[PDB]
Amino acid sequence: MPGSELISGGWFREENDQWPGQAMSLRVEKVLYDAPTKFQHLTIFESDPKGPWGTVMALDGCIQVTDYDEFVYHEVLGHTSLCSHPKPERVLIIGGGDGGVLREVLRHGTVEHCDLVDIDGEVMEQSKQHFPQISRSLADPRATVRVGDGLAFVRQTPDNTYDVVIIDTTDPAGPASKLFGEAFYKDVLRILKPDGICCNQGESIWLDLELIEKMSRFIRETGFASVQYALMHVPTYPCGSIGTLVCSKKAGVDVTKPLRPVEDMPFAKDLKYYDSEMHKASFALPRFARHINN
Amino acid sequence: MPGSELISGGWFREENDQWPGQAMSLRVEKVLYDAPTKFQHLTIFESDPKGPWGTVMALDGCIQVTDYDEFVYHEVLGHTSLCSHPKPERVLIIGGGDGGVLREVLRHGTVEHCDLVDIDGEVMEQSKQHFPQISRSLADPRATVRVGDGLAFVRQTPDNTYDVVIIDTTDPAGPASKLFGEAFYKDVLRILKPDGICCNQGESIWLDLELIEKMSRFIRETGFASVQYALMHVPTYPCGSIGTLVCSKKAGVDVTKPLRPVEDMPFAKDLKYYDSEMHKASFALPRFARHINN
Numbered sequence A, B: 001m002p003g004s005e006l007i008s009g010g011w012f013r014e015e016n017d018q019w020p021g022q023a024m025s026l027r028v029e030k031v032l033y034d035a036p037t038k039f040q041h042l043t044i045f046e047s048d049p050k051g052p053w054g055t056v057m058a059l060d061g062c063i064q065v066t067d068y069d070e071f072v073y074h075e076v077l078g079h080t081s082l083c084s085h086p087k088p089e090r091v092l093i094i095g096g097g098d099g100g101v102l103r104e105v106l107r108h109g110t111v112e113h114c115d116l117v118d119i120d121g122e123v124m125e126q127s128k129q130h131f132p133q134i135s136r137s138l139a140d141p142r143a144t145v146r147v148g149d150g151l152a153f154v155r156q157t158p159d160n161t162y163d164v165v166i167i168d169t170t171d172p173a174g175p176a177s178k179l180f181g182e183a184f185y186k187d188v189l190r191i192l193k194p195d196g197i198c199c200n201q202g203e204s205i206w207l208d209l210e211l212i213e214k215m216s217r218f219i220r221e222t223g224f225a226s227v228q229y230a231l232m233h234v235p236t237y238p239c240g241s242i243g244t245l246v247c248s249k250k251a252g253v254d255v256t257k258p259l260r261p262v263e264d265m266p267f268a269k270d271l272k273y274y275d276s277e278m279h280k281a282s283f284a285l286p287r288f289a290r291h292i293n294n
C-alpha cells in the first residue's frame, strides 16, 4: 500500500497500519530508485552521510535492509538454521531476493546447492545495482535463483528435497500474505527431509505477539516436532527487533544449543553479530513472551 | 538543545544530534506538559490510542519512558544489580526521578532504605501526575527522595555507605554530562561498601560504542574489579535498545550469572521482562560489541 509519499521533507517516514502510531524515520540524502514493480513498491535511497545507515531499501513502505545493520538478520537466519542441522547440503530460500541470507548460507562448506525463489525479480536486480555486498552471492554456481511465487514453488517440489528451508519474506500485507498461513507450512514440512530445519521471518514480540502464538501453534500442529522463537536486535525493523521461528521436523532436537557450532568453521571470525553465545541467548525471551518457547 | 519544536504535523519526532540522521516518531493525541524546568525541557504527551505506547515522556527531546515498555529498563537495572549482590540493604539511585527503578528495588525484601537524588524536581512531580504506575514508589517510607545534582550528592556522601548505586541518568548532553565522567565514578566507588555493585544508563552499542568502551576502561582504572555490559530490548530508546554497565567493587564477582536468583523471591512472577534466563542472556553481546565484556 504505502509508496513514494513516505518520502517528504528530506525524510523517509515508515508509517504503516501494521504499526499504527509510530514511524521510524531516516533522513534522505539522495533517492536512487523509486518505482512500482510488478508486485510491490520499491524505494532505495542513500541516507544522511552524517548518520551510519548508508543505503536503505523499502518494499511497500517497509524498511527491508540498510547497509549498517543488515548483517544481523542475515547472519541469524543463515547460521541459526544451518548450525542446528547435522549436515545441511540442500537449502531452500523463499523470498531473500536481496541475497543476504544466501550469502550467509553459502559460507557453510556442507552446502552443495541452494534454491532461491523470490516473487519480485526487480528486488534481485536493484540489490545487484545498489547493494553489492549483500547481493554478490546471487551469482554463485551453488545457487539457482528463480523469479516466482514461493507457494507455487513448494507445491511443485518433491517430498524430502531440502535439509533447510528459510522463509525470508516481507510482512503479511502484500504478496507474502499466504506464506504466513498453515497450508504453506504444511508443504514446507513435506519438502523437508526427516532431519530438516525451517526458519522464517517471524515478526515482532512487541507488535505481533498474537500472530507469533498462532503460527508457533499451527506449525507444531502441522507436524513439526518443535518450534522456538529466536529474538535479534535490528534497529531498522519496527521496534528494533525481529525474530525467527526455528522449527525441527525431527523429534528430540534442541535447536537452542548449536549442533554444529560456527566456531569450528573457518569463517566464524568474519561474522559481525552471530556466534554460539548469541545463538543460545536469542532463545531467552522477555517474561511476557517466554511462553512461545516454554 | 531541542524543545517544543519536535512536535509537528501531529507527531513527536525524536530528532537529535546525538543520533544524526534518524528519529523515532510517535503520533501525539494530546500534549499533557510542555515547558522548560529549572534544568531541562520536559514534554509529556498521550500517544495514539490506536497504538500501544500510552503516555510518553521526553527530556531535552529524548524519550525517557512510555507506558508500554517502561518495565524493561526498570526491571533490568533494579534486578540485575540487586540479584548480583549478596544482601543489598542500602541502595542509592542517582537520577531516576520517575521512580521506576525505585519501584523495582523496593520489591526486594532485603532493602532497608533507598535514597534517590534527581536534579529536576519537576520530573518527580509530573511522573506522579501522569505516570502513577511508574511513580507509585516515590513516597514509600523506605525511600528518601531529594532534589539535587547527583555529582554533589555522591561527593558529600561518606565512604562505605551503600550496597548498590544505580545511576539512572539522561544522555550526556545536558545536566547528566559529568555523571558519564571519571571523577563521578571515583566517588561512586568510594561510597560503595566493599562488596558493592553499581550500574548505570550505559547507552547504545549502535551509537555509542566508543563511549561505552571508554567508560568501561575508566571505571576499571578507578578501582572497580569488574565491569560487564548488559543489553536489553527497549523499542522507544534510540535504535531499540540500551545497556547498563554492571560493576563490582570486589574482585571475584561474576555479575553475569545471578548470585541470588529472582525465582527464589516471591515477586518473580510479577515481572514482565526480567528473569534469570534474561539476566544471563543480557550479557551475550553481538561480535562487534564483544570487546566491551571480553
Ligand SMILES: C[S@@H](CCCN)C[C@H]1O[C@@H](n2cnc3c(N)ncnc32)[C@H](O)[C@@H]1O
Pocket (backbone or CB within 6 Å): A059, A064, A065, A073, A094, A095, A096, A097, A098, A100, A101, A117, A118, A119, A120, A123, A148, A149, A150, A151, A168, A169, A170, A174, A175, A176, A177, A179
Ligand atoms: C527483501 S527480502 C527481506 C529483507 C531481508 N533479507 C523479502 C522478500 O520476500 C519476497 N516475497 C514476498 N512475497 C513472496 C512470495 N509469495 N514468494 C516469494 N517471495 C516473496 C519479496 O519480494 C522480498 O524480496
Ligand SMILES: C[S@@H](CCCN)C[C@H]1O[C@@H](n2cnc3c(N)ncnc32)[C@H](O)[C@@H]1O
Pocket (backbone or CB within 6 Å): B059, B064, B065, B073, B094, B095, B096, B097, B098, B100, B101, B117, B118, B119, B120, B123, B148, B149, B150, B151, B168, B169, B170, B174, B175, B176, B177, B179
Ligand atoms: C527520567 S530518568 C530516565 C528515564 C528512565 N527511568 C533520568 C533522570 O536523570 C536526571 N538527571 C540528569 N542529570 C542529573 C544530575 N546531574 N543529577 C541527578 N539527576 C540527574 C534527570 O533529571 C532525569 O529525571
Ligand SMILES: NCCc1ccccc1F
Pocket (backbone or CB within 6 Å): A062, A063, A064, A073, A168, A169, A170, A171, A201, A203, A237, A238, A242
Ligand atoms: N517490518 C519488517 C519485517 C521484516 C523483517 C525481515 C525481513 C523482511 C521483513 F519484511
Ligand SMILES: NCCc1ccccc1F
Pocket (backbone or CB within 6 Å): B062, B063, B064, B073, B168, B169, B170, B171, B201, B203, B237, B238, B242
Ligand atoms: N536516549 C535515551 C537514553 C536513556 C536511556 C534510559 C534512561 C534515560 C535515558 F536518557
